Amino acid sequence: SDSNTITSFQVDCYLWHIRKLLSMRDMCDAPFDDRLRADQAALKGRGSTLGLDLRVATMEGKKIVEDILKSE
Amino acid sequence: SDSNTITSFQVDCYLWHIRKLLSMRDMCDAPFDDRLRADQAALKGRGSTLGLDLRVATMEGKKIVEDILKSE
RNA sequence: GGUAACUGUUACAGUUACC
RNA sequence: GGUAACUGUUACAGUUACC
């Protein structure tokens, strides 16, 4: 495995989750929803490529984002 | 102006800031950096289109994202 | 050679915001 | 009519990870 590849995937998963919360609350525009849809399919492909569960990678991405923000 | 368009831009700006932090810590892979570069140009275009300052929009996206995560 | 995601460019169709 | 960003499809060239 490549460490930064996994880290990038986990963070992309968590940032997708944040974006989805915005859409769910009716706070986003249509192109934003278009990107959500396309990125969801892309993250499924990357997760299969890396052999990583998406739910678990999202939780790991949350920890990574919180740590780099705590260090900012 | 359209409220969800502005909100979408503010949030995209703040998430770009988070991604940039990961890259400045050399924790990302090359495609992640390619996306960062492309999205920085795109956000400059959207900010010009909306007449919005990117630094301010980034701070406003931070508040929106924190408010959403707080109510999750 | 293959799988996956992406970047630059190209052609067509479209969505949104604004003028 | 235009500006901006994007989505789907297409063509070419690359980047990365893994096999």
Residue numbers in the entry:
A (entry chain B), B (entry chain A): 1 to 72
What did the paper state?
Encoded by the smallest of the eight viral genome segments, NS1 is a multifunctional RNA-binding protein, which is considered the main weapon of the virus to antagonize the innate immune response of the host and to ensure viral replication in a hostile anti-viral environment. While the effector domain is to some extent dispensable for the biological activities of NS1, the RBD plays an essential role in several activities that require the interaction of NS1 with viral and non-viral RNAs. This is best illustrated by the total loss of pathogenicity conferred by the alanine substitution of Arg38 and Lys41, the two main residues involved in binding of RNAs by NS1.
As expected, the double substitution R38A/K41A, either in the H7N1 or H5N1-origin RBD, abolished their binding to both RNAs. Surprisingly, the negative impacts of the double substitution (R38A-K41A) were very different for the H5N1 and H7N1 RBDs. Under the stringent binding conditions that we used, the mutant H7N1-RBD was unable to form a stable complex with AWFC01. In order to search for complementary clues for the apparent sequence specificity of the H7N1 RBD for AWFC01, we solved the 3D structures of two other complexes: (i) R38A-K41A double mutant H7N1 RDB with AWFC01 (aaH7N1-RBD/AWFC01) and (ii) wild type H7N1 RBD, with the slightly modified nonspecific RNA “ZKO*” (wtH7N1-RBD/ZKO*). While the two complexes crystallized in different conditions and space groups, noteworthy similarities were observed with low rmsd values of 0.33 Å for the proteins and 0.71 Å for the RNA. When comparing by superimposition the structures of the three RBD-RNA complexes, subtle structural differences were identified, mainly for the RNA molecule. Relative to the wtH7N1-RBD/AWFC01 complex, the RNAs in complexes aaH7N1-RBD/AWFC01 and wtH7N1-RBD/ZKO* differ by rmsd values of 2.00 Å and 2.21 Å, respectively, whereas the difference is much smaller as regards the RBD (rmsd of 0.26 Å and 0.33 Å, respectively). Surprisingly, this revealed that in the high affinity dsRNA (AWFC01), the RNA axis is bent in a non-symmetrical fashion, whereas in the two other complexes (aaH7N1-RBD/AWFC01 and wtH7N1-RBD/ZKO*), the RNA axis bend is distributed symmetrically from the centre of the duplex.
